[PDB]
Motif scaffolding. Structure first.
Motif, PDB file in Angstrom:
ATOM      1  N   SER A 156       0.825  -1.205   0.000  1.00 34.78           N
ATOM      2  CA  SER A 156       0.000   0.000   0.000  1.00 34.78           C
ATOM      3  C   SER A 156       0.861   1.258   0.000  1.00 34.78           C
ATOM      4  O   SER A 156       1.832   1.346   0.752  1.00 34.78           O
ATOM      5  CB  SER A 156      -0.934   0.014   1.212  1.00 34.78           C
ATOM      6  N   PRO A 157       0.503   2.237  -0.847  1.00 38.46           N
ATOM      7  CA  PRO A 157       1.114   3.564  -0.841  1.00 38.46           C
ATOM      8  C   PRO A 157       0.998   4.253   0.515  1.00 38.46           C
ATOM      9  O   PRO A 157      -0.077   4.275   1.112  1.00 38.46           O
ATOM     10  CB  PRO A 157       0.300   4.334  -1.891  1.00 38.46           C
ATOM     11  N   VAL A 158       2.109   4.807   0.990  1.00 43.52           N
ATOM     12  CA  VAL A 158       2.084   5.774   2.080  1.00 43.52           C
ATOM     13  C   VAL A 158       2.243   7.190   1.536  1.00 43.52           C
ATOM     14  O   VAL A 158       3.259   7.519   0.925  1.00 43.52           O
ATOM     15  CB  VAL A 158       3.190   5.491   3.116  1.00 43.52           C
ATOM     16  N   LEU A 159       1.228   8.021   1.759  1.00 45.30           N
ATOM     17  CA  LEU A 159       1.190   9.363   1.187  1.00 45.30           C
ATOM     18  C   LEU A 159       1.281  10.430   2.272  1.00 45.30           C
ATOM     19  O   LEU A 159       0.790  10.235   3.383  1.00 45.30           O
ATOM     20  CB  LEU A 159      -0.087   9.562   0.368  1.00 45.30           C
ATOM     21  N   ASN A 160       1.905  11.558   1.946  1.00 51.42           N
ATOM     22  CA  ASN A 160       1.923  12.706   2.850  1.00 51.42           C
ATOM     23  C   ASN A 160       0.693  13.604   2.695  1.00 51.42           C
ATOM     24  O   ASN A 160      -0.286  13.222   2.053  1.00 51.42           O
ATOM     25  CB  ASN A 160       3.224  13.514   2.701  1.00 51.42           C
ATOM     26  N   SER A 161       0.756  14.795   3.284  1.00 53.74           N
ATOM     27  CA  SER A 161      -0.399  15.685   3.358  1.00 53.74           C
ATOM     28  C   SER A 161      -0.689  16.372   2.024  1.00 53.74           C
ATOM     29  O   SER A 161      -1.671  17.103   1.894  1.00 53.74           O
ATOM     30  CB  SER A 161      -0.190  16.734   4.455  1.00 53.74           C
ATOM     31  N   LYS A 162       0.172  16.133   1.038  1.00 55.24           N
ATOM     32  CA  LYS A 162       0.011  16.719  -0.291  1.00 55.24           C
ATOM     33  C   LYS A 162      -0.153  15.643  -1.364  1.00 55.24           C
ATOM     34  O   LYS A 162       0.070  15.903  -2.548  1.00 55.24           O
ATOM     35  CB  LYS A 162       1.203  17.617  -0.627  1.00 55.24           C
ATOM     36  N   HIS A 163      -0.539  14.442  -0.937  1.00 52.63           N
ATOM     37  CA  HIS A 163      -0.839  13.326  -1.843  1.00 52.63           C
ATOM     38  C   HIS A 163       0.387  12.836  -2.617  1.00 52.63           C
ATOM     39  O   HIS A 163       0.265  12.343  -3.740  1.00 52.63           O
ATOM     40  CB  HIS A 163      -1.966  13.696  -2.817  1.00 52.63           C
ATOM     41  N   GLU A 164       1.563  12.968  -2.012  1.00 50.37           N
ATOM     42  CA  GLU A 164       2.809  12.526  -2.634  1.00 50.37           C
ATOM     43  C   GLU A 164       3.348  11.265  -1.966  1.00 50.37           C
ATOM     44  O   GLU A 164       3.125  11.039  -0.776  1.00 50.37           O
ATOM     45  CB  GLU A 164       3.864  13.632  -2.569  1.00 50.37           C
TER      46      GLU A 164
END
Length: 198
Positions: A156-164
């Protein structure tokens, strides 16, 4: 942290970059190119099964795509990249139905993150879930975060607060509320970018 919500419609960013495997989850990174765990890619290869582009419960799917080949990362890190045939047996084009997620230079401890995948997808008929949490530890290629995860959430992708894209899940401790991730160093970013279809 146990804050898990269903993403009922996955046609929008960043949710349309998430794909469903049989055993877990991947992210679309570039043209025809998916990033996931090694055992997810390997066990799918011997069944020769399709991948589902952002499957959700009410979304209207992005299609189901055959795997072309698999490239594994030679090092110890739980990272494999996956190429698809871009035309599905419905005639859907892969690159017209996904987005490419951006990298995310880099991360810090105490950052708020999102884990998006398919926890217990065989039992839910593969609903997409978002789970929020916090990075507790970064050491080189390793990271730890306290977002709620069930298996399921392999790759699963781990994303930051800016969808990166910061990295991907590979392991839990022990239901799990401390989980371990492959943190994408510049060296790992180099490997992935070199293996995107062109």
């Amino acid at each position: 942290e146990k804050n898990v919500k269903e993403i009922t419609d996955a046609t929008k960013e960043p949710y349309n970059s998430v794909v469903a495997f049989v055993g877990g989850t991947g992210v679309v990174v570039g043209k025809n190119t998916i990033v996931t765990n090694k055992h997810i890619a390997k066990s799918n290869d011997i069944f020769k099964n399709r991948v589902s582009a952002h499957h959700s419960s009410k979304g209207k799917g992005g299609g189901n795509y055959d795997v072309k080949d698999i490239v594994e990362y030679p090092g110890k890190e739980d990272l494999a990249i996956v190429h698809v045939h871009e035309t599905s047996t419905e005639g859907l084009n892969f690159n017209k139905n996904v987005s490419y997620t951006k990298f995310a230079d880099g991360a810090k401890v105490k950052d708020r993150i999102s884990v998006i995948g398919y926890p217990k997808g065989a039992q839910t008929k593969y609903k997409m879930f978002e789970s929020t949490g916090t990075i507790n530890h970064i050491s080189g290629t390793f990271m730890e975060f306290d977002a709620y995860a069930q298996p399921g959430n392999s790759g699963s992708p781990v994303l930051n607060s800016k969808h990166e894209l910061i990295g991907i899940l590979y392991a839990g401790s022990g239901e799990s509320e401390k989980n371990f991730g492959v943190y994408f160093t510049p060296q790992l970013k180099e490997f992935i970018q070199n293996n995107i279809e062109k």
